[PDB]
Each structure stands twice: as structure tokens, then as C-alpha cells.
Amino acid sequence: NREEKILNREIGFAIGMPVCEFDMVKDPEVQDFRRNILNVCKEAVDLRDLNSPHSRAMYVYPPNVESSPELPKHIYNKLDKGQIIVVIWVIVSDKQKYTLKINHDCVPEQVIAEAIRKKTRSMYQGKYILKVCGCDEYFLEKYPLSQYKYIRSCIMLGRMPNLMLMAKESLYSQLPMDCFTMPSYSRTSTKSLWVINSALRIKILCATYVNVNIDKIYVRTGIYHGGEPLCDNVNTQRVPCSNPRWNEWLNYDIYIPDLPRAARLCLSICSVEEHCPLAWGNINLFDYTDTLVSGKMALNLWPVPHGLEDLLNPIGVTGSNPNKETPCLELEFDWFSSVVKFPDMSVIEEHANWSVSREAGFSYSHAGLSNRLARDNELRENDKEQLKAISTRDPLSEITEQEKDFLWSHRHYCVTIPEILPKLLLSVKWNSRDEVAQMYCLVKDWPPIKPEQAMELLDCNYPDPMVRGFAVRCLEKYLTDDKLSQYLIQLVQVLKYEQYLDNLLVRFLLKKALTNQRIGHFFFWHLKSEMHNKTVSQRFGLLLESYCRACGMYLKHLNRQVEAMEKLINLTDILKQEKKDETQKVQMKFLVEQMRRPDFMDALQGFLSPLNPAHQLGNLRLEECRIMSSAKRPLWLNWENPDIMSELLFQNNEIIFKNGDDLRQDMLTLQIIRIMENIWQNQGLDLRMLPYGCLSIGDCVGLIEVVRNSHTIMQIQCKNSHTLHQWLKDKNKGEIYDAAIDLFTRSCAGYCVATFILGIGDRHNSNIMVKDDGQLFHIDFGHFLDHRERVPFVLTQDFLIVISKGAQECTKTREFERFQEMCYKAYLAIRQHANLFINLFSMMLGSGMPELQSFDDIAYIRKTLALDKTEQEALEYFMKQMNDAHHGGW
């Protein structure tokens, strides 16, 4: 009791709302989620206690590894006959280094042995472990050394890997034994939907809290499966709005047995001609227990989002508005003197088998009645090619009603080309129980597809729980922890599309978060960052509760980060509101005084970076901290790295704290840049990008990683077109000059292509940066997509002079020709992976990012990548856009 009350206070602090507010929720789905989700918590904790203490160390410090053990060709050529130089440090009480030359695919135990041999020569293996010097990353698992991300980065960047030898007992002692306690809250016939001979009818009674300045109003309604209507929309009779009452039964063109599992009532109160929506709301026609909704219901509605022309909002969240001081539409559903439940799978399978059997016995003339019917023997070779051709089309490509009939009719052949599944599912008649039942049985036995292809089936086009269950099973089987970490933002976002709180996706994500602390860390922060959003605050709040009960000791470390962030929010809010007009000098005096307060100073020191929890943030170097003069006035913050071997990585950790701007756009752009870079490297195309760390922690508040040893193009030129080339020539004298120009041209090529494809905000001297070694990169990816196509990054003469090595006619050179060749190969490489990028954007539609509101916004990428065109026409398109932007050259 006392232990639980203390734990509840900690969880309450982590999530930003008290636990007791969840206890007060009457909704049975909420209380059932809280109870039933603890099974996932139990399972996760058992795996942690399985092979203790190693399994606990693997949870807290998981291997930061790539998915593939294999290496590219150009990366292997940087090695010395398939070998790497590695420095292994040993602390003695002084720092003793031991330089080893070993095979890139050596196991940590072999690496430790070779270090002990060198120590012996100067005058056992299983008692030690390797730690990365300067941060809390360990090599606890027997992987090839090159598969560890730190090591592969050192090879690619041409740096020396510095590891530290540490005793196993030193690490294991630092990890406390967590004790997961189960909380206190853990303690008329029934007929099928299919035996109901009746059409769908819903009564609209009346609205309350209809506060407006607007002649008459009406309740628009519709029956939807995802974004797709299952019948025509039905309106009520018009009413002045002075009196909001109707009491009118709306009749829909759908037979009750034909209602699919994920069917939803979508509605809105509108005003008139120029029709305009006032408030909107969506309801699941079946509840979480598979029961059809019956009797009276009251739905609090939402305010209309900005820029939405449509009267209904089908893809908007389902369920009632938490704010009860809002338009509250009263509804009544039809009653059938019994509990109406959705039929179970055995009944569905029986009917599917019955339909399949009947269809196989259809004559030529019967099959001829419908283009959705087709006999098995009539499947020709040209049809098989057409199906194959349809499967290679991108997700935004239109599937015609003819192609839908075609796809459905050959659905059994579609099993042999399993990547076509998304196309087949949109060809299904979701308002026909005969078809849907057969689709379920095909989905049940459907072959496994790649995680990236499965991810599409979790977006807003695929609401059916069998479809989404199949997708989750593909992730469980094939998604690596590396790729899960990479796609975690998308997977968190598609939780919003789930009909119910308890589902297969959230169970999969929670288990991974509770068996891998690196995943758990960002899982927590992605959820916590949107707790202000009342669309998702209950779902995310309840999910966070279940995480915080089972995550173990890390809750306390998370609470250090939460308090640190809250203190920075509080200080920046005061500077923004109270002391915005004052000078840099006076604001800094206020800031230093407030931070040096006893409670603030402890809160802002000695915690883990939310950008990367392997980085320890020690004491604040307040002398190095700065308020910057840019928009929103971000804090440049500087902490000591308290790691014993900090000098070998970095002595100071610099982070930008920014309060006022939305950073979710930047997060998505930075993720995509990293994926683009990854595709280029695997294709033998070394275009070095700089996807700096960026984490939204809240409503228009977040953290940004500082790139060390970097300057803006304005900072170069301010101290003439040759100034930039002269700066790099001065910074890289002698033999290393060519490496700098080569790094500049390669990085410049990557950013030219990447920014053009994505439609990033206009580039200029203040938001383009360059490192000392020549590495060019961009900052502030505030806007993207169609915010005709644009060229955001225009290579002015400054940049072209660097590529051509100080030549006057830089446009006509072999260096520029090679730079163009990099851009063409880079552009076409991304073209081949267009589905991934389209899907990654499609999974983010549910977020409230104003640049990504509909599928029309994502269609910008279809234009920039030229997907309707051929590969040669795509190059010619790309060249034309570059030529017109630069006024000749391409």
C-alpha cells in the first residue's frame, strides 16, 4: 500500500498527470486495458529475470548493432586486408592503452583475449566486457566487431575505435534488481450479427452546448471503413440551431450482417450554397468486446481542423471529446431484444469455405454475370503479368474499379505474389460479408512480407483487425531492434488509428519497450511529447502507466530527465513572456541566477541526455551556456561529460533547447535523410549526410544535437565568391586538401538530391553549415513537401567554386561532371525505394503536422521522384529542374 502510493507518485510525475485520474474513469474499456495489459508487463519482466544478471544487463545496455553483419565493398576497402586497428584501454590505480590489429569480424571475447595477450607480453577472458570510451555503451553480446554501430562509424569516418576494458562485476553491481509488483487494480439472448435480417438505422435525438454567433444546421452522417464509405451519406432535416433537436431516424443503404468489423459512424454538425462543418465526431459501430452498439449514447464533438474543406472527418480519431464543455450530440441506436455480437472466426471460416465451394462450382455463364467472378482454368499468362505489374505500383497510384474487380477475381493467384496484398485489400468489397469472410481466410494463411511492406498495412487505409494483426505478426517475426528503433516514430503514430486500446500493435510495442531500454526510452518520450494532445492523451497516458510500472529502475532515471526538461520549459517560458524585450546581457544574468538556485541546479545536472541516454550529462558549464538571438530564442546548453575517458569522445556535451517551434517536421526529415544515406552507402555511393539528433519532448518544445566544429556559410563569408573555397583550403592544407573537396562535393550532392525530393524550406547562408573537414550539411528542416516543384538548395557560385577547385569556369569542368553523376545516381537510387518513403509519410498523416494533412500532400514526392515517368524521363526531369533553378548548367 505505502510502496504502491510512492510508485504512483513517481509514475504520475513521469506522465505529467496523477494515476488516480485513471481510477476515476468509468469506461470499462479503460479499466480492462489497465488490467489486461499487465500480462505484457509480466512477460517482459520474466525475460529480464531469465538469464540473470546478463539478461538484465542486455535490457539496460542492449547491443547497438546494425541489422546486417555483412559490409559494403567501398567500406571494406578502407580496412587493411579485412582488418581494423583498435585501441583497448585498461584503467589501473592511470590509463594504459593497448593498440590491437585484428580482423573486422572478431567477437568481443577474442578482442578481450588479444588485449590480455598484449598486457601479458609487456611483463580471464570471460570475466571482462568491452565498453565504448566516453559513453555508456557496451558490447555485451557476441556479434562481429564491425556490426556494432560505433565500430562501423569509425571505419566509415576514418577514426580510431577506443574501447575500455571493464570487469563484469563492476557493471552488474551498478544495475539494481528491479521488483515488479502487480498493482491493486489488477484484482435477452446473445445473437450473432449475421442472423439479423434488418437494414441499418441510427436515431439522432438532439445536440447541447451548441454555442454559435449561422442560420440553420443539420447532422451529416456516414458509414465508413477507414476512409472508404460503405454506403451513401445521410443528412437530417435542417433546423435553426436556436433549437438543436431532430429525433429523426436516418436510414442507410447497408444490410446489418454486411457491416464489417471495423465499421464506424462518422458524423458532423454542419451549417449552410456554402456548407461548412462546425463540429465533428466518430464512433465505432462495434465495441472492444465485439458487441454492436445499442441504446442511447452521448458523443462530445471536436473542433474542425484548419484547412479541411470536407464536411465529415472519417480519418479523425474515434470516440468522445474529453472536454465536456463542447457540442454534445445525443444518439440512439437500434435495439433487437438481445446482445448483438460480431460472429467469431469459426463461423467466419465456415461461411468463407461455403462461398469458395459454391464459386468453384459456377458455370461459365454464372461467372459471366460479374467481373468480380472468374473461373480457375481461364487464368492466362498475360493476366499473371498484369497482376505482377499492378503490385510494383506505388501506394498513391490509383487502382481503377476495373483493376479492383480483376484483383479480387484472381485473389487466389495473388497468394503467389504476396507483396500485392495492400492492393488486393483495397479491392475488397468491405460492405459484403461474403467477400470479407474470404479475405480473412486468405489473410490468415497469407505468406510473410517484409517489415517495410507490412508497415503500410498499419496506416489509416487498413482499419481491419485481421489485416493489422497480420502486419504485426510480420513485424514480430522479421523486424530487428535496429529497424524498430529507426521506425519507432511511425509505429507510435499508427497506434492512433487503432479502434481500441487493447490491440496486437500496442502489445508488440510495449513488450519491445520493456525488453529493450533503448527502444523503451524513445517509446516513453514519443508518447510523453503528445500528452498535451487530447485526441490521444488517454490512450498514451494509459500506455505510459503500463510502461512505467514495468520498466524497472529506469523510471527514476526518466524522472530526472522529466524534471530537468520541466525546469527548462519554466525558465524559457518566463524569458518568452516576462523578459522578452530585455538585452542578451540582462537575460543571461536572470538565467544564471535562476539556474544557480539549489533546487534548479540539482535538477539541471547529473542526468541522461534524452537525445541519447548513453550520454551522461554531468555538471552544467554555465559560462559556456548562451541564449541565442534567433527565432524563439533557444538555449545553447553545455554539460561536462563525467565519463572517465571523456577526452576520447567529447569532454563537453552541447545541446540546443528550443521552446516555441514544432520540431516533429525536423524529426521526420532527419529520419528520412538517415534512411536515404543508408540506401546510398549500401549501393556503393558514399554521400555523407549529417542527420543531427532532434527530439520533440512536448508541445512545440524539444532538444537538438549541436554539431561540433561547424560554421554557417554566413560565418565563413563575413569572416566575394572565393571566400568559402579559401576557408576550406586554409582549413585543409597540404595532402588533406583533396579529401576535403571530395567530402564537400559528396555531401553537397546528397543534400541537393534529398532536399529536392522532400521539398524542404528554402536554403540560404544561415541554414546551411559546413564542418572544418569539408562536410556540408543543412539545419532547420521546418517545412517539407508542397508547402510546379521547387529547388530548395540552389548551388550559388560559392559552392561550385569549391567543387571545381578554385577554377573560374566551374560549370564546365570534369569535377562538376562527376558531381552531377553523383546526383543522378543518388536521385535514381531513392526512386527505387519510393514506396518506403511514401509509406513513412503515410504513417505520419494522423499527427497534427500542418504540412502533412492528406494523401495529396504526400503526392508531392510522386512528382519530385517522377514515378509515372520512365527512369530516363526521370533523369531528364531532374536535370530540367536543376537547369532552370541555376539558369543554365544542367
Ligand SMILES: Cc1ncc(-c2ccn3ncc(-c4ccc5c(c4)[C@](C)(Cc4ccccc4)C(=O)N5)c3n2)cn1
Ligand atoms: C549563429 C549560429 N551559431 C551556431 C549555429 C549552430 C552550430 C551548430 N549546430 N548544430 C546543430 C545546429 C542547429 C540544428 C537545428 C536548428 C538550429 C541549429 C536552429 C537554427 C536554432 C539555432 C539558431 C541559432 C543558434 C543555435 C541554434 C533551429 O531552429 N534548428 C547548429 N547550429 C548556427 N548559427
